[PDB]
Structures are given as C-alpha cells and as structure tokens.
C-alpha cells in the first residue's frame, strides 16, 4: 500500500497508468497565487471524479503557506538540484511521509515522478532521505515511461484539464516573466 502526493492533474494522469490502487495526497503551499491554488485543486478533483480515485485534501492556509515560504526563504536559484527548489520539494515529500506514516501506508511517492526526466535524480535523493527520517519507504519509478505520458497528454485534451505553464511559487512565476 501506498501514499502518492500529488502535484498537478496532467502528472497524477500519467502516473495513474502505472498505480491506481493508491491513496493520494494533494497537498503544495508552494502555489501562489490562491486563485493558482483552486485552480489546479479543481484539475485534480476533475480527474479524481472521472477515475473514481482516493484523494485526500492536505492543508493550504496563510499558516501552511508561510511555513513554506521562510523554509525557502533563504535561497535565490530556481532549477533541479538548486538547493531552493531541493527544500521545498523536500518539504511536501516530509509533509506526505508524515501523512504516511500517521495513517499506516507502508509506502510514499509522489506523481513529481510523472515531471521531465531530468528531474528524477533531485526527487530521488529527497525521497531516500525523508525515508530513513521517517520509516515510510519511497517508491522511485519513472512514471512517464511505458507510453503512460502521451497517454495523460491525450486524456488532458479530453477532459479538458488546466496544464500550467509555471512551477508553483511566486519565484518561478516571475522566472516564467523573466
Ligand atoms: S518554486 Fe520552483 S523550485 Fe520553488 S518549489 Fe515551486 S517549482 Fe520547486
Ligand atoms: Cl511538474
Ligand atoms: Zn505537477
């Protein structure tokens, strides 16, 4: 068994190819603006009613938020393996082991996995990390793979999901501005 945070509804598409017996986790203080927030919440809901999947709603607050942000504060560098973008992703991964742990699962991953490729190795090391702080296996697979990602792209295009053009973060959205 196995707890999946979810980052966005075109990679929870691509990832659900590969595992749909899961419990997943929607859970990214990292997005800002709100409206960005609702928007792809409402994406992943959109796919989990058409599934019929198991997702669950983790906590998005002016609190959560902030936690996020001074766990970033410190950093000024966007990219893989940029230790900003390492300690957040690290901080929804520690938020999903916690859940993991909690309710039970014997395993966590996270549809990031489903994201270009050159990310896998950041996502990797994080997860092995978060693992022995927390006794929760992770589960590593390269979900784009096996046809799984021109799969999510076609029923992206069915169903009319929100595909974003940026990370999440106020920084990436100036980044995307230049
Ligand atoms: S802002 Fe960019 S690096 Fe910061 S968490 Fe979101 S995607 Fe990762
Ligand atoms: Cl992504
Ligand atoms: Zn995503």
Redesign the pocket.
């Known amino acids: 068994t196995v707890l999946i945070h979810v980052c966005c509804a075109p990679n929870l598409l691509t990832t659900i190819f590969h595992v749909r017996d899961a419990e997943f986790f929607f859970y990214n203080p990292?997005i800002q603006p709100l409206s960005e927030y609702e928007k792809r919440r409402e994406a992943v809901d959109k796919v989990a009613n058409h599934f019929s999947l198991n997702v669950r709603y983790g906590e998005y607050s002016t609190e959560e938020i902030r936690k996020w942000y001074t766990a970033?504060k410190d950093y000024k560098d966007?990219?893989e393996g940029?230790k900003?973008?390492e300690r957040?992703?690290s901080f929804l991964l520690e938020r999903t082991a916690q859940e993991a742990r909690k309710r039970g699962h014997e395993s966590f991953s996270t549809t990031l996995l489903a994201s270009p490729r050159k990310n896998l190795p950041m996502i990797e090391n994080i997860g092995k990390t978060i693992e022995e702080k927390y006794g929760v296996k992770f589960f590593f697979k390269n979900f784009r793979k096996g046809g799984a990602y021109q799969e999510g792209v076609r029923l992206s295009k069915e169903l009319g999901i929100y595909r974003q053009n940026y990370?999440?973060?106020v920084?990436?959205l100036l980044?995307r501005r230049e």
Do not use: A, D, P
Request: proline content about 0%; charged content about 15%.
């Open positions: 990292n970033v966007l990219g940029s900003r973008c957040c992703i990370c999440g973060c920084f990436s980044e």
